[PDB]
Structures are given as C-alpha cells and as structure tokens.
C-alpha cells in the first residue's frame, strides 16, 4: 500500500499548479493542496455571482429591446 500512497502523493502534487516544477515535502504537498482548494472555492463562488449579475443585466436588456 505504501507504493500506492507514494503514487497518490505524486498525483495530488501534479494537480496543484503552485507545485509545478518543485518536489515539495509531503507536508508542503498537503498544505499547498489545502490552500489551492481554498483559493478555488472562493474563485468559483465569485465567478458564479458574476454569472448571476450578467443574467440579470441581460434579462433587463432583453426587456428594453422588447417593447421597442
């Protein structure tokens, strides 16, 4: 199983962009993955709220184009 933990560590490591080209320690791999998930959750939330704003702006512009 310890070879599979080694491979899974390498797979987690390659998926974190701040760890590209660096052989970080196991603690640094876990820490950077935790920070990356934090960063991405806030980033996708901000994006989803931007998409909500665009849908509402477009819905109003459609109502302005209609009635004209």
């Amino acid at each position: 199983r310890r070879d599979h933990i080694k491979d899974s560590f390498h797979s987690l490591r390659d998926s974190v962009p701040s760890l590209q080209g660096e052989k970080a320690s196991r603690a640094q791999i876990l820490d950077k993955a935790t920070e990356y998930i934090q960063y991405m959750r806030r980033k996708n939330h901000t994006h989803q709220q931007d998409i909500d704003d665009l849908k509402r702006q477009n819905a109003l512009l459609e109502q302005q184009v209609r009635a004209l």
Binding site: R1, H4, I5, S8, F9, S11, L12, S15, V16, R26, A27, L30, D31, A33, T34, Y36, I37, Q38, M40, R41, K43, N44, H47, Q48, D50, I51, L54, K55, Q57, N58, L61, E62, Q64, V65, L68
Partner: protein
Amino acid sequence: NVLERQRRNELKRSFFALRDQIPELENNEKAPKVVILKKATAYILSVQAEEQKLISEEDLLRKRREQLKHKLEQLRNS
C-alpha cells in the same frame, strides 16, 4: 529522535486539514491516508473543471450583453 516524532505529528495535522476541506471526507475520522489523497486529487480536478465551465458561461453571457446593447442602440436609432 524527537524531530521525526514532531514531523510525523505535523504531517498528521496536515492530513486532517486537507481532509476537512473535501466535502466527501469532511470530519470523517476513519478516512485512510490514500483516500484523503485520491479524494483531494479528484476534488481539485473537479473545481478546475468548474472554473473552466464558469469562465465559458461568463464569456457567452458577456457576448450576449454586447449584442443586446448593439440591438438596443440600433432600435433606438431605428
């Protein structure tokens, strides 16, 4: 020595901190180490796939907004 005993404990805390961020394993004490790593890997790939989808949705919406404004300006100028 005393150093690796502290290095193994910090590693153990790091595993818990990573695990408590995966919604599937959150607060799951019985989650093995290889399960934390593989679920963290699959979760990271899923939020990277989500970022791509949202940027794609955002780009289409922006494209529609400027086409609805061009349509409105054309109508207001007949």
